[PDB]
Design a protein around this motif. Sequence first.
Motif, mmCIF file in Angstrom:
data_model
loop_
_atom_site.group_PDB
_atom_site.id
_atom_site.type_symbol
_atom_site.label_atom_id
_atom_site.label_comp_id
_atom_site.label_asym_id
_atom_site.label_seq_id
_atom_site.Cartn_x
_atom_site.Cartn_y
_atom_site.Cartn_z
ATOM 1 N N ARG A 67 51.667 1.338 2.187
ATOM 2 C CA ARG A 67 51.002 1.514 1.077
ATOM 3 C C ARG A 67 49.737 2.265 0.964
ATOM 4 O O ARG A 67 48.940 2.482 1.776
ATOM 5 N N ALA A 68 49.491 3.255 -0.200
ATOM 6 C CA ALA A 68 48.291 3.814 -0.420
ATOM 7 C C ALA A 68 47.349 3.094 -0.944
ATOM 8 O O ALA A 68 47.505 2.217 -1.859
ATOM 9 N N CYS A 69 46.140 3.106 -0.400
ATOM 10 C CA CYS A 69 44.758 2.567 -0.964
ATOM 11 C C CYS A 69 44.655 2.786 -2.457
ATOM 12 O O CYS A 69 44.367 3.997 -3.005
ATOM 13 N N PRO A 70 44.388 1.721 -3.435
ATOM 14 C CA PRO A 70 44.618 1.978 -4.808
ATOM 15 C C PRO A 70 43.053 2.404 -5.163
ATOM 16 O O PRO A 70 42.762 3.095 -6.241
ATOM 17 N N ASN A 71 41.983 2.299 -4.225
ATOM 18 C CA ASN A 71 40.628 2.465 -4.374
ATOM 19 C C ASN A 71 40.484 4.189 -4.089
ATOM 20 O O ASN A 71 39.255 4.750 -4.275
ATOM 21 N N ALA A 72 41.460 5.016 -3.354
ATOM 22 C CA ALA A 72 41.233 6.156 -2.962
ATOM 23 C C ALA A 72 41.837 7.429 -3.935
ATOM 24 O O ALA A 72 42.707 7.279 -4.494
ATOM 25 N N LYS A 73 40.517 8.138 -4.268
ATOM 26 C CA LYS A 73 40.856 9.305 -5.107
ATOM 27 C C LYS A 73 41.849 10.574 -4.537
ATOM 28 O O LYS A 73 42.478 10.937 -5.384
ATOM 29 N N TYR A 74 41.563 10.640 -3.325
ATOM 30 C CA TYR A 74 42.436 11.675 -2.478
ATOM 31 C C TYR A 74 43.361 11.027 -1.579
ATOM 32 O O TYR A 74 42.863 10.326 -0.689
ATOM 33 N N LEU A 75 44.662 11.468 -1.491
ATOM 34 C CA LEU A 75 45.557 10.993 -0.638
ATOM 35 C C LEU A 75 46.120 11.801 0.192
ATOM 36 O O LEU A 75 47.050 12.757 -0.265
ATOM 37 N N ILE A 76 45.765 11.747 1.417
ATOM 38 C CA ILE A 76 46.555 12.496 2.646
ATOM 39 C C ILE A 76 47.691 12.048 3.081
ATOM 40 O O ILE A 76 47.754 11.074 3.497
ATOM 41 N N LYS A 77 48.905 12.960 2.903
ATOM 42 C CA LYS A 77 50.113 12.415 3.572
ATOM 43 C C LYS A 77 50.912 13.708 4.217
ATOM 44 O O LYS A 77 50.334 14.799 4.274
ATOM 45 N N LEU A 78 51.711 13.351 4.861
ATOM 46 C CA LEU A 78 52.620 14.383 5.695
ATOM 47 C C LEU A 78 54.037 14.272 5.274
ATOM 48 O O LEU A 78 54.450 13.377 5.465
ATOM 49 N N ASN A 79 54.507 15.379 4.607
ATOM 50 C CA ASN A 79 56.110 15.475 4.391
ATOM 51 C C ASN A 79 56.521 16.497 5.560
ATOM 52 O O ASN A 79 56.001 17.563 5.570
ATOM 53 N N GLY A 80 57.527 15.957 6.183
ATOM 54 C CA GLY A 80 57.878 16.513 7.600
ATOM 55 C C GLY A 80 56.749 16.382 8.626
ATOM 56 O O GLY A 80 56.480 15.250 8.797
ATOM 57 N N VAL A 81 56.082 17.515 9.174
ATOM 58 C CA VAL A 81 55.411 17.287 9.936
ATOM 59 C C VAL A 81 53.827 18.197 9.500
ATOM 60 O O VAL A 81 53.200 18.624 10.373
ATOM 61 N N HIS A 82 53.881 18.220 8.211
ATOM 62 C CA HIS A 82 52.714 19.298 7.443
ATOM 63 C C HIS A 82 51.882 18.238 6.801
ATOM 64 O O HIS A 82 52.439 17.654 5.819
ATOM 65 N N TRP A 83 50.643 18.112 6.779
ATOM 66 C CA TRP A 83 49.937 17.733 6.017
ATOM 67 C C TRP A 83 49.603 18.098 4.667
ATOM 68 O O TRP A 83 49.671 19.257 4.417
ATOM 69 N N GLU A 84 49.688 17.159 3.820
ATOM 70 C CA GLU A 84 49.328 17.515 2.114
ATOM 71 C C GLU A 84 48.330 16.670 1.613
ATOM 72 O O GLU A 84 48.054 15.437 2.306
ATOM 73 N N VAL A 85 47.701 16.998 0.478
ATOM 74 C CA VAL A 85 46.901 16.047 -0.255
ATOM 75 C C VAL A 85 47.077 16.138 -1.630
ATOM 76 O O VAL A 85 47.090 17.040 -2.183
ATOM 77 N N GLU A 86 47.025 14.656 -2.133
ATOM 78 C CA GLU A 86 47.218 14.625 -3.738
ATOM 79 C C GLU A 86 45.699 14.001 -4.234
ATOM 80 O O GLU A 86 45.061 13.539 -3.641
ATOM 81 N N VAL A 87 45.524 14.436 -5.411
ATOM 82 C CA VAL A 87 44.535 14.026 -6.305
ATOM 83 C C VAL A 87 44.704 13.189 -7.432
ATOM 84 O O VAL A 87 45.733 13.738 -7.890
ATOM 85 N N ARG A 88 44.330 12.016 -7.745
ATOM 86 C CA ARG A 88 44.541 11.190 -8.695
ATOM 87 C C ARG A 88 43.521 11.936 -9.788
ATOM 88 O O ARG A 88 42.232 11.673 -9.603
#
Length: 150
Positions: A67-88
Amino acid sequence: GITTYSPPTDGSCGWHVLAAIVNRMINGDFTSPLPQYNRPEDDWASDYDLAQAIQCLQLPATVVRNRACPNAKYLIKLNGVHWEVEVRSGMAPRSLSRECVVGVCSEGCVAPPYPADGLPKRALEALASAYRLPSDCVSSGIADFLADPP
Ligand SMILES: [Zn+2]
């Protein structure tokens, strides 16, 4: 409506992700201004490194697991083995707890508004100075800078 930043795959991906979050908060520019730094796989920023740096830089960001924290503006994820970041893109930033940051917060966690003075004076300079250090030393680097810079 979401915007995802994918850094160059130089192996410093993790630190580019944090640079982007800060670059967006400060300038509206959701990209890393850090020079590329090619790193052996053993020195790729880990979930733990990112989490410690988030706290040094006091970023409204989370490393998502299940689960992604619903209070977090920025969401750091990794697809494959590389970091990415989403912004709401809308969403006001909230000051997150360690559990929220680390991505283990339970259903219906609570976070207060992130203050205007929440971000360190020169947070991005700090990250610039420290990101070429070994990944597990970067946070200490960042912290060093924020205690006394030139
Ligand atoms: Zn949370």
